[PDB]
């Protein structure tokens, strides 16, 4: 649904979708050959099906070709300042693929807008849909376009076939949000039986490790998934299938 969305929004008023309550098989995403840029900040593009996440964000764009480099941590530039800000400690992937077919009409497809004037750079994931006229001088504008009074939005266009870095790149961005809470979106692993009192290599809801899983006497609260020790290491775990 998110990847094959009918139409996306422009970068300035970008659409955010919430993804949860499932299993997910990202390996098909990596094995597509349809994605010109598949770069991730922290993950192996592989092995991504061995993880568990609480909330998976899907942000998605109409940015320009030469611009894709800016959808990344630590970048600075036109979109990365007033249109979309990734945080420094971003934990996700940035999937880009030029859709010139979908939106590039002769005489240019102009549906897609971007803020060009802004007083201050955005905070991470901050979205600004303000349509106030930009006061670029010392005199008030009062919604009157003219000198030092410019509407802060502009239309990209994306000429049909004139884009080498001037083409629509629907940059979908996954932001992987984990509270060390109930993970909810994690990949197709077969939940084998459980073995007790024996050293095993376990993977509970994305929490990995090696140890001896024994019956406890601790009293967990209904909202708690796992205890911890003084060392910040895992101490007790709730079986996600058996309470």
């Amino acid at each position, epitope marked *: 649904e998110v990847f094959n969305a009918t139409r996306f929004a422009s970068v300035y008023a970008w659409n955010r979708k919430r993804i949860s309550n499932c299993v997910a098989d990202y390996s098909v995403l990596y094995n597509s050959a349809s994605f010109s840029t598949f770069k991730c900040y922290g993950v192996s593009p592989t092995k991504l099906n061995d993880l568990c996440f609480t909330n998976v964000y899907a942000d998605s764009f109409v940015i320009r070709g*030469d611009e894709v480099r800016q959808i990344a941590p630590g970048q600075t530039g036109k979109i990365a300042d007033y249109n979309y800000k990734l945080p420094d400690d971003f934990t996700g992937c940035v999937i880009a693929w030029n859709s010139n077919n979908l939106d590039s*009409k002769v*005489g*240019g497809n*102009y*549906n897609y807008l971007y803020r060009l004037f802004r007083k201050s750079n955005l905070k991470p994931f901050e979205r600004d849909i303000s349509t106030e006229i930009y006061q670029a001088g010392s005199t008030p504008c009062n919604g009157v376009e*003219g000198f030092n009074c410019y509407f802060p939005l502009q239309s990209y266009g994306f000429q049909p*076939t*004139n884009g080498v870095g*001037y083409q629509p790149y629907r940059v979908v961005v996954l932001s992987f949000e984990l509270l060390h809470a109930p993970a909810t979106v994690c990949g197709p692993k077969k939940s084998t039986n459980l073995v007790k009192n024996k050293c095993v290599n376990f993977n509970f809801n994305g929490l990995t490790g090696t140890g001896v899983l024994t019956e406890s006497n601790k009293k967990f609260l209904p909202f708690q998934q796992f205890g911890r020790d003084i060392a910040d290491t895992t101490d007790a775990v709730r079986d996600p299938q058996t309470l």
Partner: antibody, heavy 126, light 111 residues
Framework: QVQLVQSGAEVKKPGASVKVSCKASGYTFTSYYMHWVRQAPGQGLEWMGIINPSGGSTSYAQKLQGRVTMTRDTSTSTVYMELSSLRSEDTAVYYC????????????????????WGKGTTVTVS | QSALTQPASVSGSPGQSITISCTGTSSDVGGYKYVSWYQRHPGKAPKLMIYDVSNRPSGVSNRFSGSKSGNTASLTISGLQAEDEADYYCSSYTSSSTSVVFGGGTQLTVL
């Protein structure tokens, strides 16, 4: 003297196909776009679609599926306008229009400024 | 979208100023800064005076100005004459199926 000329008028009955030209003058034919606007009787002006003199890439209004194919000629700087399966409301004054910027690489200015014009060419269908 | 809304006919007097309204959709005028107006001398070709809402081609008399707010574009003619009697059409790019929309038109009759 940058000026656009189509052919004379046509008299059609429904179901036919019609050939409208538009030669250009006074500029570089491969730079600007060619826009096309008609005037239905009593209702205002109406754009079909366009064609790029550089490559010939086409597009048009959804409401005009399959009933329009825009062709062109770079050698004579002439662009051609086609409308098949003609109906009564197709009676209109058909204009050829030039874009107010040259096709430019890595561009920003949008290419729908309708600024240079044909004399006009009325279609009669009944 | 649909055809824009223009007054059917506005009259006045020479030297007096008359303004013409143009209402559309937020996807026709309110999302964009691309309003352009036109005029019809009877039996003649269009002529562009307005584009970039308040901007102008070279050679248009300083009597015609364009304005923008909300869903309303507007054209103002300062110092009217019988020279000015014509039909008037506002145009805009749209963020939808089509790309260009026009108003119904306005006949300015000089009395």
């Amino acid at each position: 003297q940058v000026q656009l000329v189509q052919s004379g008028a046509e008299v059609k009955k429904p179901g036919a196909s019609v050939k409208v030209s538009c030669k250009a003058s006074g500029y570089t034919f491969t730079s600007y776009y060619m826009h096309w606007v008609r005037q239905a009787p009593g209702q205002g002006l109406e754009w079909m679609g366009i064609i790029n003199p550089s490559g010939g890439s086409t597009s048009y209004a959804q409401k005009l599926q399959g009933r329009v194919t825009m062709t062109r000629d770079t050698s004579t700087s002439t662009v051609y306008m086609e409308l098949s399966s003609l109906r009564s409301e197709d009676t209109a004054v058909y204009y050829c229009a030039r874009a107010n910027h040259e096709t430019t690489m890595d561009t920003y200015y949008y290419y729908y400024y309708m600024d240079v014009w044909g004399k006009g060419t009325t279609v009669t269908v009944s | 979208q649909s055809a824009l809304t223009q007054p059917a006919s506005v009259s006045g007097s020479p030297g007096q100023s008359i303004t013409i309204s143009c209402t559309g959709t937020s996807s026709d005028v309110g999302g964009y800064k691309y309003v352009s107006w036109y005029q019809r001398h009877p039996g003649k070709a269009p002529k562009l005076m307005i584009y970039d809402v308040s901007n102008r081609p070279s050679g248009v008399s300083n009597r015609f100005s364009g304005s923008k707010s909300g869903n309303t574009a507007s054209l103002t003619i300062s110092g009217l004459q019988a020279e000015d009697e014509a039909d008037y059409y506002c145009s805009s790019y749209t963020s939808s199926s089509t790309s260009v929309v026009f108003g119904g038109g306005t006949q300015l009759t000089v009395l």
